[PDB]
């Protein structure tokens, strides 16, 4: 997967998905896909890691 | 144990508010006291037109 | 990333779950046990409550 050359080194030092964002959906409440896209793809709101 | 950064930009959500800038409540809490500092200060304070 | 004129101190609060240990001495407290009482509160078309 191609990646910016100024991606942070410490991001790879810990357990993280290669997407650049966390992908946990069990954090959000059950049975709502809109909140799930808000966790996954929405860049209005920050990710659940940093 | 995820490293995080505290920065000026994240710190601006309090730094960009009117309660910093306006002096009226500071002035009110300062002059509503019985005795202020000895009032002797007189120099430039207002310009005097010739 | 230019330093502003003023530094800042940041204050936060944290919660911690603690399992405690409680010690108590003998004859610390006297307890007086009464007699329980019965009352009827809601009579409904389905079921009645006491």
């Amino acid at each position: 997967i191609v990646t910016p050359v100024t991606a942070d080194v410490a991001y790879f030092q810990k357990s993280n998905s290669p997407r650049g964002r966390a992908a946990c959906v069990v954090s959000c409440e059950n049975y709502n896909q809109e909140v799930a896209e808000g966790l996954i793809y929405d860049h209005s709101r920050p990710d659940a890691a940093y | 144990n995820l490293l995080l950064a505290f920065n000026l930009q994240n710190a601006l959500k309090v730094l960009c508010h009117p309660r910093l800038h306006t002096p009226a409540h500071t002035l009110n809490s300062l002059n509503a006291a019985p005795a202020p500092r000895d009032r002797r200060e007189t120099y430039s304070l207002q310009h005097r037109r010739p | 990333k230019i330093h502003p004129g003023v530094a800042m101190t940041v204050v936060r609060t944290d919660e911690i779950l603690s399992e405690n240990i409680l010690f108590s001495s003998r004859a610390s407290t006297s307890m007086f046990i009464g007699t329980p009482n019965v009352s009827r509160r809601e009579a409904r078309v389905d079921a009645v409550t006491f």
């Binding site: 966390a22 946990c24 959906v25 954090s27 959000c28 909140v35 799930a36 808000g38 966790l39 929405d42 709101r45 659940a48 890691a49 | 995820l2 930009q9 710190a11 601006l12 959500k13 309090v14 730094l15 960009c16 | 800042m8 101190t9 940041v10 204050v11 936060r12 609060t13 944290d14 919660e15």
Partner: peptide, 28 residues
């Protein structure tokens, strides 16, 4: 109104999910 709208939009701008836990309010 324009300047206040700009300052509100640039910096000031529920959460969908969180991984770490209950967030802590930071005061400066």
């Amino acid at each position: 109104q324009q300047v206040n709208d700009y300052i509100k939009a640039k910096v000031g701008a529920g959460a969908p999910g969180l991984c770490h836990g209950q967030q802590a309010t930071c005061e400066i």
